[PDB]
Amino acid sequence: APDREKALELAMAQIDKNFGKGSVMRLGEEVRQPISVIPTGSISLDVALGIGGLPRGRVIEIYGPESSGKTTVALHAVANAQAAGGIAAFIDAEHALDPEYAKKLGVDTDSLLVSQPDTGEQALEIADMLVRSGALDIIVIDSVAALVPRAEIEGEDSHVGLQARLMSQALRKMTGALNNSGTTAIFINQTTGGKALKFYASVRLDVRRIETLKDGTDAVGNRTRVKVVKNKVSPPFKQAEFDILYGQGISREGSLIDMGVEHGFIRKSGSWFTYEGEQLGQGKENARKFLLENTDVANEIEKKIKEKLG
Ligand SMILES: Nc1ncnc2c1ncn2[C@H]1C[C@H](O)[C@@H](COP(=O)(O)OP(=O)(O)OP(=O)(O)O)O1
């Protein structure tokens, strides 16, 4: 009887000593703790990730439909890793970034590095050496797909001299660097030229806009769902949902009203949210309005919501 479970252990462990940690996991295991971790400014996602945020020194991929949220996450990530004496670098090859939105998200623009490569090759070289300086915490590439080769942009084919070669290369040599430097790297998507990225990424996130969050009126943002389809640091397949308000981004408040009930610290006495006797208000975003101004109560709720997990 114990020979099986014990033979599986000697073996299992054997697998880690040859191929790393998360080589063989078990969807249940809570096995743990890597101090280094950048909170995504989404308590929700953070636990779904298992280790409470994006691992540092690992390459990451956030993919999905347009306008779902991927970059809003990445930018929150920046802001966190940044508000802790972190130095971020945003290699922009889409010319889409909006500093006024980034600021409201807590990002330090003035101190944010911004490269606007010309060739895909350039971007990955600049990113590479820039990560080798071991000075950066996080680095994000906006749009994997928009990293076209020097050739495709000139004339010199029919697919052969590839992008999904340019990707395998840079990814190969840059993967190591990150390990040492302990810099964690976010890549945005929408394979294409990937097929190599999907393998490297120690964590892959499948983002998608589920609901169209309205505040009675009609528009305020939208509900985003995220499935962590690959995780070599914790158990995969967990998922999370959070609110994104056209203006502020991931709703901290909302993120609590959700967790607050999914964990009983708040009661649904019929569309009427309540916490320890006193009422928060009727209507999901009416309670967020309560949790907004009353930070004391939220601090305790967040505090209790955090103690109930880890
Ligand atoms: N500058 C902005 N001001 C206000 N809301 C914004 C802004 N940028 C994005 N949003 C809001 C509106 C959208 O419903 C939502 C989409 O987030 P966003 O981070 O742009 O997703 P994304 O970058 O993952 O997707 P994409 O693949 O199209 O690049 O966020």
From Swiss-Prot:
One record GO biological process: SOS response
GO CC, any one term: cytosol
Positions annotated to bind phosphate: S67, S68, G69, K70, T71, Q190
Keywords in alphabetical order: ATP-binding, Cytoplasm, DNA damage, DNA recombination, DNA repair, DNA-binding, Nucleotide-binding, SOS response
CDD domains per the UniProt record, alphabetical: RecA (cd00983)
Pfam families (alphabetical): RecA, RecA_C
Binding sites annotated in the UniProt record for ATP: S67, S68, G69, K70, T71, T72, D98, P99, E100, Y101
GO molecular function: ATP binding; ATP hydrolysis activity; ATP-dependent DNA damage sensor activity; damaged DNA binding; single-stranded DNA binding
UniProt KW Nucleotide-binding keyword: yes
Annotated InterPro entries: AAA+_ATPase (IPR003593), DNA_recomb/repair_RecA (IPR013765), DNA_recomb/repair_RecA_CS (IPR020584), P-loop_NTPase (IPR027417), RecA-like_C (IPR049261), RecA-like_N (IPR049428), RecA_ATP-bd (IPR020588), RecA_C_sf (IPR023400)
Phenotype upon gene inactivation: Not essential in the absence of DNA damage, its deletion renders cells much more sensitive to DNA damaging agents such as UV light, ionizing radiation, alkylating agents and DNA gyrase inhibitors and desiccation-induced DSBs. 5-fold decrease in survival, loss of HR, no change in NHEJ (non-homologous end-joining) or single-strand annealing DSB repair.
Compartments where located: Cytoplasm
Subunit details: Polymerizes non-specifically on ssDNA to form filaments. Interacts with and activates LexA leading to autocatalytic cleavage of LexA, which derepresses the SOS regulon and activates DNA repair.
UniProt record similarity statement: Belongs to the RecA family.
Function noted in UniProt: Required for homologous recombination (HR) and the bypass of mutagenic DNA lesions (double strand breaks, DSB) by the SOS response. Can catalyze the hydrolysis of ATP in the presence of single-stranded DNA, the ATP-dependent uptake of single-stranded DNA by duplex DNA, and the ATP-dependent hybridization of homologous single-stranded DNAs. Numerous X-ray crystals have been resolved under different conditions which indicate the flexibility of the protein, essential to its function.
Protein known as: Protein RecA
Natural source organism: Mycolicibacterium smegmatis (strain ATCC 700084 / mc(2)155) (Mycobacterium smegmatis)
Record gene name: recA
